[PDB]
Design a protein around this ligand. Sequence first.
Ligand code: NAG
Lengths: 100, 50
Amino acid sequence: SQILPDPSKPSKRSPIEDLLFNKVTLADAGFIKQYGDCLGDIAARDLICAQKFNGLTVLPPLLTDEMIAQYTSALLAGTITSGWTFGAGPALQIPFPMQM
Amino acid sequence: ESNKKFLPFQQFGRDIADTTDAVRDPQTLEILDITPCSFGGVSVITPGTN
Ligand SMILES: *[C@@H]1O[C@H](CO)[C@@H](O)[C@H](O)[C@H]1NC(C)=O
């Protein structure tokens, strides 16, 4: 249960993945740092607006976090329900104690 | 319009990159903020010209 995805939460991440994502602090994720946000003028000028005003930008990655989580979940399901058979061809079912 | 509280002996405002971002009008003693005009990057997506 500690490594399988949790359907209760919207992003469908395991508790360990939740802790890992909460532990690491990210500055810019490549999202839309809109020019409106910089012109908001909240009297707190951060470094992101200064970087943007001088021609430096950050591009978002092609793969989102949800797709990586889906890949991890697929790998976990394959390695749990089949063992090492799905890595060399069609997946073959086998009880877990027999695999161990 | 600027919300900054300039001291009575101050006339200009600078930022990290050493550029003027706040100014005081010579006629009316009012504080103003300067923001660069809108800009962005453009990309073109196309298949082959054949
Ligand atoms: C400068 O002259 C204009 C026009 O007469 C006037 O409105 C303004 O108050 C003057 N500036 C100062 C600092 O008195």
